[PDB]
């Protein structure tokens, strides 16, 4: 509860530009609303797809490296406290993210776009 | 006592042109993104343009793009909106508006304050529809608003708003479900996808108004419900 707040903050931290400058780059991505007791393999699977989105050459390069890293500790100390349709549906999720950021050609406005979506989307899930 | 105030609407001949003028008192106006919406004769309301808060960056509707052009002196707290190449479709009273959309989240195209508009009269998309049309109802009774969306509303992204007689429209509702600040709890917003709901649960004399729904999740245009009536009984 107090380490998802943390998430957010650093997610809201590592903002670059303004979506003003990017809404002709809005996509809705679908995202499963519904799916948040066995919420934990569903939150454990957010987290993780979180952090390969996050981890990748093409987020180093377009994020501060060192809000990067306390954003996967972060991410890696929700993991700790919680330790298959619903699963299947968050990857298929993250595969349309990708997917929008390869057609994008991984432009900051496309990961604006994507870190906003990740706003609302890690809200969401952890309520 | 914080407003918006537009001016520079007129009777005008076809193929001619109008400034229009937003005055915003009560607040740094230098920090919000603004907007210009329409509302012709018996029609829904209607996005026009949109502006950065430090003005390099803008948008406009399809059908009055390169005939208008949205300006700003942030000095002088004022947004413009040069409208030229009038038709008829272009008779509306236009409203400024402010975005309550914030950077942390990006939810940009909806408004938290609103002008009563300024009248411009040319001398002779997602769909959202609102059900019922009209509610004659009492005061002290519950009221039950819908708002159906032609596709998903990306990100629950819907705001409700108040239109009281004489009074500029109002932000009651944004994200489908967060009450706006000063906002009562008899106001209630539920819903996703495609199907949303307002609630009054008891109404009071100043809540016979048309209340409208707007979903603001896509690529611009923002797209606006036709309204429902609640009147007094």
């Known amino acids: 509860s107090l380490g998802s707040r943390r998430t957010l903050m650093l997610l809201a931290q590592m903002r670059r530009i303004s979506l003003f400058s990017c809404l002709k780059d809005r996509h809705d991505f679908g995202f499963p609303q519904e799916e948040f007791a066995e919420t934990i393999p569903v939150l454990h699977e957010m987290i993780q797809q979180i952090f390969n989105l996050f981890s990748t050459k093409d987020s180093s390069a377009a994020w501060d490296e060192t809000l990067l890293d306390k954003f996967y500790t972060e991410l890696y100390q929700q993991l700790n406290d919680l330790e298959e349709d619903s699963i299947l549906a968050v990857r298929k999720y993250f595969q349309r993210i990708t997917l929008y950021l390869k057609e994008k050609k991984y432009s900051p406005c496309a990961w604006e776009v994507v870190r906003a979506e990740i706003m609302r989307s890690f809200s969401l899930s952890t309520n | 006592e914080v407003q918006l105030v537009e001016s520079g609407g007129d009777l005008v001949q076809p193929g001619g042109s109008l400034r229009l003028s937003c005055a915003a008192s009560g607040f740094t106006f230098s920090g919000y993104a603004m907007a210009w919406v329409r509302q012709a004769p018996g029609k829904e309301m209607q996005w026009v343009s949109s502006?950065?808060?430090?003005?390099?960056?803008?948008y406009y509707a399809d059908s009055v793009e390169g005939r208008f052009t949205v300006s700003r002196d942030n000095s002088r707290s004022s947004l413009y909106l040069q409208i030229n190449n009038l038709r008829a479709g272009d008779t509306a009273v236009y409203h400024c508006a402010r975005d309550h959309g914030g950077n942390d989240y990006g939810d940009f195209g909806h408004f938290d304050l609103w002008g009563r508009g300024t009248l411009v009269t040319v001398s002779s998309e997602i769909v959202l529809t609102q059900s019922p049309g009209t509610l004659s109802l009492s005061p002290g009774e519950g009221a039950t608003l819908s708002c159906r969306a032609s596709?998903?509303?990306?990100?629950?992204?819907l705001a409700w708003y108040q239109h009281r007689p004489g009074q500029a429209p109002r932000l009651l509702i944004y994200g489908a479900s967060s009450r706006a600040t000063g906002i009562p709890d008899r106001f209630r917003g539920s819903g996703s996808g495609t199907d949303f709901t307002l609630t009054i649960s008891r109404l009071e004399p100043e809540d016979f108004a048309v209340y409208f729904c707007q979903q603001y999740g896509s690529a611009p245009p923002w797209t606006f419900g036709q309204g429902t009536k609640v009147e007094i009984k």
């Open positions: 596709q998903r509303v990306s990100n629950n992204y």
């Open positions: 502006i950065s808060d430090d003005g390099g960056t803008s």
